[PDB]
A = this chain, B = another copy of it.
Amino acid sequence: GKLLIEGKTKQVFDVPDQPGLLLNKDRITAGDGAHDLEGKAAISNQTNAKVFEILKSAGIKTAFVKIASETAFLSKKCEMIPIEWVTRRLATGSFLKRNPGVPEGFRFTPPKQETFFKDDPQWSEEQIISAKFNYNGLLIGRDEVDYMRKATILIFEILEKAWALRDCALIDMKIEFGVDTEGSIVLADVIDSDSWRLWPSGDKRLMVDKQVYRNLTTVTAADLDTVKRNFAWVKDQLDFLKPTIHHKVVVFMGSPADQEHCQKIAKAARELGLDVDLRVTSAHKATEETLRIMQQYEDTHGALVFIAVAGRSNGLGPVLSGNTSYPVINCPPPSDKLVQDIWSSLSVPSGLGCATVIYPDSAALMAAQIIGLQDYLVWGRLRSKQLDMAHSLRQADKKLR
């Protein structure tokens, strides 16, 4: 195809037969300013593809489609916003110079998020809005900037979580956005070892990112070798960042009439990425088999959450709660009588940890939030959903306004 953007470290060519883009990474390392050559285009492409796979799986919207080759990938075509979106958890790097008196390692809670223009000075959100950027029919106002701030922090938080599985502190990051043909903002650049600052064991001294290359006043080929060896370690480490954690959410309904209600729970949880079993059993009509079924689920080494669905007077949830140590959530089905009956769920006898929820979606969310403590991906999807809902409100606000 035809070239449409040239870059220090990458070229992006049109793909005219497939209505996108192809991004081709080059074997150069351009320490901000210094520039030398390497064998690193393959390392970056793989690092990148892996990250975008993690982010797609969380539900974040990206331009990334699939790897084309060992050095290139296919991207959805979109017009880039000329802002670098940067997130920090700690104070380090150029931030220390811009903010004298703040010591290295000062923790940003929530993560600090800053913006930078080309061509590369710092901009305020006000500056971005007054700049009146316009891409693919989408004019960038505070709503669009709000979304990108929130998205940037979120992507940092997800990856921060991922890297902690291999004992690495993600310290800061830079990403870039673009606007697709349909007017949607997508995460669109490249996230590799040039995009971030990584500390193993939270030890700055063990840094594995492109800061190693920046620190070099003089650059020998030997020096470049440790930087290639550093980036390869990171590309390798990413293969451990998407693990399959084992868990089961079991919904016990006291009667088969509660089916549609349970399927609403199931549908919600499965979309959050949960493994859900629907079971029918009564704590009144089949007391012994109820315990026997729950004991069978208790033969696991994975995580386990029970959801109790029982109309009228709910003894099922409290009886589970009394015989198991795994969390039990009560989700009575909808009913006119729920106003009277809910106290059979609440107000359990002393020493039972049964918790109560009133809507099927909210029960799946409780189960997700519990299991997300072990599966950063589920936890990612919960945060992504919050961003989705907030972004949808603005769409609605814009229509009634």
Contact = CB atoms under 8 A, between A and B. Distances in A.
Interface stretch (A7-15, A76-84, A94-102): A94-102
A375 to B, nearest CB: 31
Contact of A103 (B100, B103, B124, B130): B130
A6 to B, nearest CB: 26
B106 A126 contact: yes
A127 interface: yes
A101 to B, nearest CB: 5
A126 B131 CA distance: 28
A126 B126 CA distance: 21
Interface string A91-123: 100000001111100100000000000000001
Contacts of A99: 123-124, 126-127
Contact of A102 (B100, B102, B106, B124): B124
Nearest to A124: B99
A100 B127 contact: yes
Contacts of A130: 101-103, 106
A106 B103 CA distance: 34
Contacts of A101: 123, 127, 130-131
Contacts of A131: 101
Contacts of A127: 99-102
Nearest to A126: B102
A102 B126 CA distance: 7
A124 B102 CA distance: 9
Interface string A280-323: 00000000000000000000000000000000000000000000
Contacts of A103: 130
A103 B124 CA distance: 13
A254 B329 CA distance: 48
A102 B127 CA distance: 6
A99 B117 CA distance: 12
A123 B98 CA distance: 10
A91 B130 CA distance: 12
Nearest to A91: B126
A130 B108 CA distance: 13
A101 B123 CA distance: 9
Contacts of A102: 124, 126-127, 130
A103 B99 CA distance: 26
A65 B101 CA distance: 36
A106 B100 CA distance: 29
A106 B124 CA distance: 13
Contacts of A100: 127
Contacts of A123: 99, 101
Interface in A18-70: none
Contacts of A124: 99, 102
Given A91-B126, A99-B126, A102-B126, 12 more contacts: A99-B123, A99-B124, A99-B127, A100-B127, A101-B123, A101-B127, A101-B130, A101-B131, A102-B124, A102-B127, A102-B130, A106-B126
Nearest first, the 3 closest Cβ-Cβ pairs linking A and B are: A102-B130, A101-B127, A101-B130
13 contacts: A99-B124, A99-B126, A99-B127, A100-B127, A101-B123, A101-B127, A101-B130, A101-B131, A102-B126, A102-B127, A103-B130, A106-B126, A106-B130
